[PDB]
Amino acid sequence: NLMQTLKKDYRLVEYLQAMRNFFLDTMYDFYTSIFDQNVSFLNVQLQELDGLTLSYKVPWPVDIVISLECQKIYNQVFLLLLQIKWAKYSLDVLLQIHRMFLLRVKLMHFVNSLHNYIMTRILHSTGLEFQHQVEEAKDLDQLIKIHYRYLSTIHDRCLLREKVSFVKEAIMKVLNLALMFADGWSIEKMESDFKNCHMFLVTILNKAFPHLESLALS
Amino acid sequence: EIITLQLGQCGNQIGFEFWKQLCAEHGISPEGIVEEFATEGTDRKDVFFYQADDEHYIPRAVLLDLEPRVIHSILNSPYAKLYNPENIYLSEHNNWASGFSQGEKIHEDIFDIIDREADGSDSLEGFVLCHSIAGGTGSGLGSYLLERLNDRYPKKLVQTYSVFPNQDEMDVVVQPYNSLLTLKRLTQNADCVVLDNTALNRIATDSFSQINQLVSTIMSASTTTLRYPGYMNNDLIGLIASLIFLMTGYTPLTTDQSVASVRKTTVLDVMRRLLQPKNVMVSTNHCYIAILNIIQGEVDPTQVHKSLQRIRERKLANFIPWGPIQVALSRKSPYLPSAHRVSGLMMANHTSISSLFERTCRQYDKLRKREAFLEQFRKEDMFKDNFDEMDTSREIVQQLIDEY
Amino acid sequence: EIITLQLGQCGNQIGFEFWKQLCAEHGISPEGIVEEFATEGTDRKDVFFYQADDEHYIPRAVLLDLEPRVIHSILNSPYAKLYNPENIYLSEHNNWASGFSQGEKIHEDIFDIIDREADGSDSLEGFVLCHSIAGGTGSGLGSYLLERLNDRYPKKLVQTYSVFPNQDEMDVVVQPYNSLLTLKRLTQNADCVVLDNTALNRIATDSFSQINQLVSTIMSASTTTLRYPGYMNNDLIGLIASLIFLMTGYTPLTTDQSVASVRKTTVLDVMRRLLQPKNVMVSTNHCYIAILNIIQGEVDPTQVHKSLQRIRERKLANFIPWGPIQVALSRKSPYLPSAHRVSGLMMANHTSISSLFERTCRQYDKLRKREAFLEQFRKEDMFKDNFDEMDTSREIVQQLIDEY
């Protein structure tokens, strides 16, 4: 009965669908303005290096589901996602002289492949399964568990919890190559670094826990 | 947002059928009205259309032509009222030099129209050009517009669907000059889709209405994901960065009568089919530079990964030795019948395209040695004194071939 | 899974009636739809068919032919819509050399079709070939396909149902050459079912429609257990290993009018009947090499053991002195009437088959001494210079006869 009167009438499920939608279109125009700060400037933009804490307002009938420590995890994945959209768009908006372009495809590929992995293979696989699960909610408690078994797993597949200084930092430091090379528009000293860190990336990730092989091809 | 610049009879038609396809996809009535079933639509319309106070939608299109007949026929079609009469332009009254001279002559009104259209969009992304490189109108007018546009707007993309002359068939006797000059301008100003009648009609076999219906299909499938926002590849610049001359291929190029064979169509078989030279709509161990496959319909990324793995192992493709594909997924319009379980479009950059120019260069060199049909060109101011323009263009094309 | 390559008029028909029998067995509608009573079926369909998004099932068949008439008639049958129009191939416009020359000419499209079909199966096991060895089409085209297939796919089985020319009846005047060359290719490339019109029509007596209905019956009964999974013999390779040229026989070869004599049919009487030379559908103390008996219907292994014991004691058969049979059981399709209480099919390898070639060799030697009908062969490139191909083929066949 409770789940029945909770689909509408304090529609907790409807609110949940919007949550994972207003981040993870609309949010494309929002970030592009940030590329070219102030704390009130953003609000009118939204209503239209690692910060931008985002929150939301939830009514009491759904407060018990989307807890306070649940907002931060949803915020955690949003921060990291933008840095990927950043590097992906920074190397995209533009269009031994031509030798730079060979450093573009050798790099614009790699960040693009990673982005194809986090969003499609993870942020859409578990998402497609989660919706098929909540539509069979039959309990006050288990709806928390099926939900809590969606964040604590999406925070693991997207490598952000542990093994950060062992694996995650590698993707982080090579992301700085997407910033340095973007501004300049020394060249030989980039591939010596790039061919090293990229090989450092594969020769470290080679330990593969098993789902990492979907990107290990490149 | 985006603008479309279509020139010559080829471009004019191309635009007609491209907008026909678009209005079919987005549920836009011929008169610009919106159907009742599509009232609550989720599809993004700003990209190619802008709505009007009368609730009708107007394309971001401009019609250009040296002759009236084609556009006059267009305005007698059921789709006539849709276009914007203000934007359409017709010359009051077949050579590249003449075309460029007119372009110099009619700068003001054309750029007036272009500016008016541009100022109506907040986030214009680039330009789309549809034209033929052989005929006098398309070649010269596109040359002039590209030059003055790259000069005017140094921060907008310029995309073209350039139609190349048939070669096996001996149409424009003076085609080598126009083609060579248009190629010069394309290299020197164009940001980024080659097209030829020969292979296009070859695949059509194995009227201009059907040929250009196929071409419009290619264009629409190319712009689908931009039209239909998703997760990845949410911008034209994303497309261009992932590849950068191009060639194209589309799997479900099936007649309205050829739906009887409802073949169980996986993603693997489609993406495979997009690789063969037969499906490449255009006609030294030449290899690829880049490949993009946009897939419409239900798709499981596990299937995509498996197909990619198998094709990689089967080594059906060849890549550059000096550098390290992409498979994007979209959603079909909710309106047109999904006669195909899953469909695929491919855009690639491959070195073999060089041969095209080698032919045209060979054609051009086969004339410049004997000064054939230069009398008309000398008439225009640009080639009134000399033809150094021609020499520079030829050397530029040679440099591009050497670079390939 | 498996593919079928049928060539020439003989092969084309063979395929038509083979697929007729298959669709009858599996409850597949003529249009490819599935009947309501067969919705919950347990029979395995992937082996010979692949389903489509439209729920229809498509055979893994390819039609090849030098002439259009036969296939055109096929497509006018009620079963026309079932086949895949893409796979079917017809030459746009009676000799082996000409057939092989065309095969060299039309390599690309044929192997395109074959690759497309192959990539749609996860666990393809081998190939099936149906053709006649006398006529120009079947002989040469099968030769070329076998050569290029054994070259292309070195890890797939190749099974054939080769139809041999009648000899008591004096049909192809140039039959000796085509037969000898096809036999060369069969020995040199074929993994593993001989067929002759003479004895086949003899048993039929004691139109091509009925003859090939019997042949399709043989093929289907051979593939039954593969189609219907059980415990043992769950793969074609299991079949081949248990035997390895072959000949065949089927007990319940009874007209639709000859069901009046419902004879109490044990397993013993059937398996016995499969041994007699009369039932061997094909026409020195020659002996056996291997025998396999597949039995359909209710069967008690005690009965099988008793029959085997009694036949062994009665020594009705002869075996090689230098080496040390098999009786497999299957289940009938749940649909076709079980007019027979228990039925039996036999495939065996026996040395007497050698005689066949001795006849054809005798035929060929009876011509090569006088250079009869070589004018057409000299026309083709393969036999343009010399006929060393013929000498090598003859010596290969002689070597095979010596080995037997």
Instruction: Render A181-214 in DSSP notation, one character per residue.
Output: HHH----HHHHHHHHHHHHHHHHHHTT--GGGHH
Q: How far apart are CA C234 and CA B282, in angstroms?
A: 48
Residue whose pair of structure tokens reads 């497509």 in the numeric block: C75
Mutation for testing the A interface, residue in B234, B325, B399, B400 having most A CBs under 10 Å: B234
Residue whose pair of structure tokens reads 């000796």 in the numeric block: C176
> Is residue B60 classed as helix, strand or coil in its secondary structure?
coil
Residue type, position C81, single letter: K
Instruction: Specify whether the CB–CB gap between B194 and B164 falls below 8 A.
Output: yes
Residue whose pair of structure tokens reads 């471009």 in the numeric block: B11
Going B393 to B395 to B397 to B399, the CA torsion angle's sign is negative
**Residues facing B326 on adjacent strands:** B292
Q: How far apart are CA B351 and CA A131, in angstroms?
A: 46
Sheet holding B61-63, edge to edge: B61-63, B2-6, B126-132, B157-164, B195-196
Q: Using an 8 Å CB-CB cutoff, list chain C residues near B266.
A: 120
B260·C50 Cβ contact <8 A = no
| Interface contacts A/B by beta carbons within 8 Å | 60
> Is residue C258 classed as helix, strand or coil in its secondary structure?
coil
Instruction: Specify whether the CB–CB gap between B220 and B22 falls below 8 A.
Output: yes
**Residues facing B49 on adjacent strands:** B59
Q: Which residues contact B166 (CB under 8 A, 6 or more apart)?
A: B196, B197, B198, B201
Burial string for A86-121 (b: 16+ CB within 10 Å, else e) reads bbbbbbbbeeeeeeeeebebbbbbbbbebbbbbbbb
Q: What is the DSSP code string of B270-315? A: HHHHTTSTTTSS------EEEEEEEEEE---HHHHHHHHHHHHHHT
**Residues of B at the A interface, defined by Cβ within 8 angstroms:** 123, 157, 191, 229-232, 234-235, 237-238, 240-242, 244, 290, 301, 305, 309, 312, 322-324, 326, 329, 403
Mutation for testing the A interface, residue in B237, B309, B312 having most A CBs under 10 Å: B237
Task: Give the other-Cβ count within 10 Å of B25's Cβ.
Answer: 20
Instruction: Specify whether the CB–CB gap between C194 and C246 falls below 8 A.
Output: yes
Nearest to C22 by CA among C219, C183, C206: C219
Q: How many CA atoms lie within 13 A of B279 on its CB side?
A: 21
B328 → chain A, closest CA residue: A116
Q: Phi/psi zone of residue C335: left (φ > 0), alpha (ψ -120 to 50 degrees), beta?
A: alpha
Going C198 to C252 to C278 to C324, the CA torsion angle's sign is positive
B241·A108 Cβ contact <8 A = yes
CA distance B340 to chain C (A): 9
Q: How many residues does chain C have?
A: 404
Q: How many residues does chain B have?
A: 404
Q: How far apart are CA C23 and CA A28, in angstroms?
A: 54
**Residues facing C290 on adjacent strands:** C349
Task: Give the other-Cβ count within 10 Å of C67's Cβ.
Answer: 14
Q: How far apart are CA B392 and CA B375, in angstroms?
A: 20
* DSSP 8-state assignment for residue C165: P
Residue type, position C356, single letter: L
Instruction: Provide the token pair at B125.
Output: 């992304």
Q: How far apart are CA A198 and CA B1, in angstroms?
A: 37
Percent of chain B that is helix, strand, coil (3-state, to 5): 45, 15, 40
Instruction: Specify whether the CB–CB gap between B156 and B29 falls below 8 A.
Output: no
Instruction: Provide the token pair at A72.
Output: 């931060």
Backbone angles phi, psi at B120, to 5 degrees: -85, 5
* DSSP 8-state assignment for residue B28: B
Going C5 to C7 to C12 to C17, the CA torsion angle's sign is negative
Residue type, position B46, single letter: D
Helices C8-26 & C136-152, crossing angle to 10 degrees? 70
Q: How far apart are CA C253 and CA C267, in angstroms?
A: 16
Q: Binding site, residues of B?
A: 134-140
Q: How far apart are CA B344 and CA B202, in angstroms?
A: 20
**Residues facing B349 on adjacent strands:** B290
Residue type, position C229, single letter: P
Q: How far apart are CA B260 and CA C52, in angstroms?
A: 12
Q: How far apart are CA C182 and CA C134, in angstroms?
A: 9
Q: How far apart are CA C8 and CA C4, in angstroms?
A: 13
Q: How far apart are CA C139 and CA B262, in angstroms?
A: 33
Deposited experimental method:
cryo-EM
Q: How far apart are CA C329 and CA B263, in angstroms?
A: 36
Burial string for C257-294 (b: 16+ CB within 10 Å, else e) reads eeeeeeeebbbbebbbbbbeeebbbbbeeeebbbbbbb
Instruction: Specify whether the CB–CB gap between A112 and B237 falls below 8 A.
Output: no
C53·B268 Cβ contact <8 A = no
Exposed / middle / buried, residue B175 (Cβ in 10 Å: 0-12, 13-18, 19+): buried
B261·C56 Cβ contact <8 A = no
Report CA-CA distances (Å) from B95 to B20, B142, C319.
30, 13, 89
Instruction: Specify whether the CB–CB gap between C145 and C110 falls below 8 A.
Output: yes
Task: Give the other-Cβ count within 10 Å of B86's Cβ.
Answer: 12
Report CA-CA distances (Å) from C248 to A38, C29, C296.
88, 30, 16
Mutation for testing the A interface, residue in B1, B235, B295, B349 having most A CBs under 10 Å: B235
Exposed / middle / buried, residue B404 (Cβ in 10 Å: 0-12, 13-18, 19+): middle
How much is the CA Rg of chain B, to the nearest whole Å? 21
Residue whose pair of structure tokens reads 């804490």 in the numeric block: A53
**Residues facing C300 on adjacent strands:** none
**Residues facing C248 on adjacent strands:** C347
Nearest to C114 by CA among C18, C5, C1: C5
Instruction: Provide the token pair at B247.
Output: 């060639």
**Residues facing C250 on adjacent strands:** C345
Instruction: Provide the token pair at B62.
Output: 């401009």
Q: Using an 8 Å CB-CB cutoff, list chain B residues near C112.
A: 276
For chain C, helix (H) and strand (E) counts, in that order, are 14, 11
Give chain A's end-to-end CA distance (angstroms, integer). 50
Q: How far apart are CA B156 and CA C46, in angstroms?
A: 54
Largest Cα–Cα distance of chain B, in whole Å? 65
Residue type, position B180, single letter: L
Pairing of strands C126-132, C2-6: parallel
Angle in degrees, CA C199, C205, C208, rounded to 5 = 75
Report CA-CA distances (Å) from B63 to B92, B215, C145.
14, 18, 55
* DSSP 8-state assignment for residue A83: H
Instruction: Specify whether the CB–CB gap between B79 and B20 falls below 8 A.
Output: yes
Q: How far apart are CA B359 and CA B368, in angstroms?
A: 14
Q: How many CA atoms lie within 13 A of B82 on its CB side?
A: 27
Distance from CA of residue C341 to its chain's centroid?
Answer: 26
Backbone angles phi, psi at B219, to 5 degrees: -60, -45
Nearest to B344 by CA among B402, B269, B394, B278: B269
Residue whose pair of structure tokens reads 């590929």 in the numeric block: A109
Burial string for C116-151 (b: 16+ CB within 10 Å, else e) reads bbbbbeeebbbbbbbbbbbbbbbbbbbbbbbebbbe
Nearest to B84 by CA among B44, B126, B51, B107: B51
Backbone angles phi, psi at C367, to 5 degrees: -115, -40
Residue whose pair of structure tokens reads 């209405």 in the numeric block: B209
Helix residue ranges, H only, C275-332? 301-314
CA distance A128 to chain B (A): 11
Q: How far apart are CA C120 and CA C270, in angstroms?
A: 40
Residue type, position C79, single letter: Y
Report CA-CA distances (Å) from B72 to B64, C84, C176.
12, 45, 72
